Swiss-Prot record, chains A, B:
1-deoxy-D-xylulose 5-phosphate binds at residues 130, 157-158, 195, 218, 231, 236-237, 240. GO terms for cellular component: apicoplast. Transmembrane segments: none annotated. Signal peptide: none annotated. NADP(+) binds at residues 11-14, 40-42, 131, 224. Binds 1 divalent cation per subunit. Mg(2+) or Mn(2+). Mg(2+) binds at residues 156, 158, 240. This is 1-deoxy-D-xylulose 5-phosphate reductoisomerase, apicoplastic. It comes from Plasmodium falciparum (isolate HB3). Its cofactor is Mg(2+); Mn(2+). The chain holds residues 76 to 486 of 488 of the full protein. It is found in: Plastid, Apicoplast.
Length: 411, 411
């Protein structure tokens, strides 16, 4: 009586992690059917996944590699998947009755489109992509109010942690990204743990001159380049503060970022009695992904057991906002509300990418973002769902262009 | 629509802690009625509590201070409690329909009697007393199977922690101290945290010569002398391993003692997927006591918030069994089963008390306990509930006398 699951962004960090925990779990007993795989342009890698997982559906977003994908799949014998392309392909998969849960491991604002269609089709959405939440929080809430059986289950590790700390008895009275969620769950405050990233011990002088190469060495697993840069600036944690606010209905004043370099405590929830519950494991994404797919239950795994004596020491310190100004900008944008989160996310997409490509320096990232936020003026929020999406899209693109403009004017 | 609560052992460490969190909570809103107070012989202190809390019932176990208690209560005007005495008084309170929950803060094996009557009357039992569980685990289970609406809610801090880490959605399918509890809750393994006590850094040479005075300095709050000595020997943790086994149906091989000297993580549960959940706060008994009385809900308090940056470092190390042989003896007794836990608890009562009164040295505690365990032979467990209690009582007294004998023969 197994779980039918689609992986969106199957060839990326989250996607290959998700396929990995799926494969391992299926050895212990067959609980997952991989029904669909969706990627952007990694046609050869998708082919290879197809040969292993033989899903009912395959989709590739980039129209130019569509034929090529079809040609490659011909070489798998006794396998006749539905091979699809683009937004249309994505919508057809979201609307399949043979699909219960969708892992969203697509990066950036782009992730919002599949997230939205997943909800609209009343699916369980195992959402790793945080940019969607940060950019479109209010919209997603409204969609979730309309689509009663849709649910977002957080995969982002801290958010998974937070969610796992909750009493499902309370959780089942509501769902994530809903008014009153913190009241129903007796949540008072959140400790949002951070690795601190590679620059955590640098002086201001050293930070001035760090390069994307320095940033790209992230210890444990290979993540996408975008989150890796965000981890280096701690804008990733800035985004995750906003994500926390939206997922769990916690005020910004009740979200504390704490640098926990050992990455064993993944985050913590203080309840209204001041008791604190935390989730712990080695730094890893297999449990967040797995839990999203088994919630409200847990299944057996053969993961390496946490050994506290082996860990020995766990440390906690506040991040320096002077060293990590991206954190402050995120708090400011979150507290300001309106579409300030959209602008924050958009301007960061551009700043992140410029720094990645060695066009700007570290403190230029924050300086560009800060200037875009300063130039933005609050807009009335559309009451209508389709208009609100168009509004989100226009502000997102304006904010990207504005970021690019600031860059181009200082070049 | 408030909670009617009785405090057994009201004048002791747990009892005064329980009255304290009750008083504080009642300021935020009136949720608790203190319906009964029960003590052994602290007649003046009980009088004072009576004047403050004006409970419906008062009981004093020691018959010789009964009249005196009655005389003192005369001096409270417009207050006419039911003033009772002894086992009879205890049974009358347990059988009151005006009492929903009973905090058991009576020490030692003696605690079992009120625990048993509480269960027999279908009450919620907020059980701090662990000696009852260790000595009579199998019996309590059978009583709980018969009394469907009786429940033990753990107050012992690690056990509270463990219980708070569970999903109440699963918990409500069962109850503590029941077959299959770990299966229903997907529990795989327990990390049982320990302060390590005052002798944690002594050499073997230093341990040889420690005194009860050295032992009695326990940092944070004043606990009873008995648990304080047990903390010094780590027999307290030995007892808590057995308690864990019985409360949560976890095998001894899945219970790991870990010394966590900062006492922030109070204990941790590994689920079958290897995700770990822990409960955290400052070292304190107010939250364990409070949770026992509000479960399955939580209420607002004004307790001091946990501040992870302030804590800064958390450490974990395995205890040395050579330094703390009491731990090993407890594991051995637990694994052996039968009435070996009874004997362990009984012989420790005597050894603890001898060391308290400067009659023996530190390693004599373990040596006496070990010898009593070695002299014990498994007995067939009575099938009948009343006979099983008599059997528990006979073995408990035999084991005390045996401990005393070993002492007297080496003196
Ligand atoms: N890596 C991690 O451990 C964590 C990541 N996250 C979040 O998860 C998301 C994914 O990150 P990560 O896995 O690192 O990113 P990667 O760059 O590693 O992977 C991105 C994936 O998305 C696919 N993709 C891109 N555009 C499209 C599109 N239009 N349609 C379909 N698929 C598309 C890519 O396909 P292609 O291969 O064809 O380019 C690729 O499979 C991000 O939002 C990130 O913040 C959150 C927590 C941790
Ligand atoms: N202190 C703590 O923080 C913790 C304690 N515990 C457990 O809780 C229990 C209580 O410990 P603690 O509070 O330290 O002990 P204390 O010695 O501080 O208090 C014992 C209490 O029990 C009462 N008592 C003794 N015999 C009887 C009797 N026959 N009838 C009624 N009341 C009686 C005493 O009354 P009187 O004042 O008249 O002598 C006193 O009120 C123990 O089993 C201990 O292991 C567990 C976790 C932590
Ligand atoms: C074993 C030596 C430590 C290994 C460090 C592994 O990296 C981690 C570990 C945890 C968190 C993160 C963040 S980025 C990726 C992310 O968002 N995740 C995983 O949810 P952060 O830097 O923003 O806090 C990175
Ligand atoms: C602030 C500096 C640290 C303060 C230490 C406070 O003492 C504690 C703290 C926690 C545990 C205990 C044990 S004894 C008492 C007990 O059983 N409890 C509270 O449930 P242990 O020694 O057996 O682990 C004692
Ligand atoms: Mn994260
Ligand atoms: Mn304890």
């Amino acid at each position: 009586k197994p779980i039918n699951v689609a992986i969106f962004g199957s060839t990326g960090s989250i996607g290959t992690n998700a396929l990995n925990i799926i494969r391992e779990c299926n050895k212990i007993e067959n609980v997952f059917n991989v029904k669909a795989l969706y990627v952007n342009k990694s046609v050869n890698e998708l082919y290879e996944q197809a040969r292993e997982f033989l899903p009912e559906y395959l989709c590739i977003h980039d129209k130019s590699v569509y034929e090529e994908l079809k040609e490659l799949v011909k070489n798998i014998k006794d396998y006749k998947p539905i091979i699809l392309c683009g937004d249309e392909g994505m919508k057809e998969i979201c609307s399949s009755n043979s699909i219960d849960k969708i892992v969203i491991g697509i990066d950036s604002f782009q992730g919002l489109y599949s997230t939205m269609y997943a909800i609209m089709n009343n699916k369980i959405v195992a959402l790793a992509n945080k940019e969607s939440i940060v950019s479109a929080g209010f919209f997603l809430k409204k969609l979730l109010n309309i689509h009663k059986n849709a649910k977002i289950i957080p995969v982002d590790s801290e958010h998974s942690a937070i969610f796992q700390c909750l009493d499902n008895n309370k959780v089942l009275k509501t769902k994530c990204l809903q008014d009153n969620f913190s009241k129903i769950n007796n949540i008072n405050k959140i400790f949002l743990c951070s690795s601190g990233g590679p620059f955590q011990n640098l002086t201001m002088d050293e930070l001035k001159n760090v390069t994307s190469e320095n940033a790209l060495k992230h210890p444990k697993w290979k993540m996408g380049k975008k989150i890796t840069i965000d981890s280096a600036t701690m804008m990733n944690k800035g985004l995750e503060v906003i994500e926390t606010h939206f997922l769990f209905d916690v005020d910004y004043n009740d979200i504390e970022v704490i640098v926990h370099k050992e990455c064993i405590i993944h985050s913590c929830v203080e309840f209204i009695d001041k008791s604190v519950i935390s989730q712990m494991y080695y730094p890893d994404m297999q449990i967040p992904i797995l839990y999203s797919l088994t919630w409200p239950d847990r299944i057996k795994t053969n993961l390496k057991p946490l050994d506290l004596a082996q860990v020995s020491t766990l440390t906690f310190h506040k991040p320096s906002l002077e060293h990590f100004p991206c954190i402050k900008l995120a708090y400011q944008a979150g507290i300001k509300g309106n579409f300030y989160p959209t602008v924050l996310n958009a301007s960061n997409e551009i700043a992140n990418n410029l720094f990645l490509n060695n066009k700007i320096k570290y403190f230029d990232i924050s300086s560009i973002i800060s200037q875009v936020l300063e130039s933005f003026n609050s807009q009335k929020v559309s009451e209508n769902s389709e208009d609100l999406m168009k509004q989100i899209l226009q502000i997102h693109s304006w904010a990207k262009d504005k970021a690019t403009d600031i860059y181009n004017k200082h070049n």
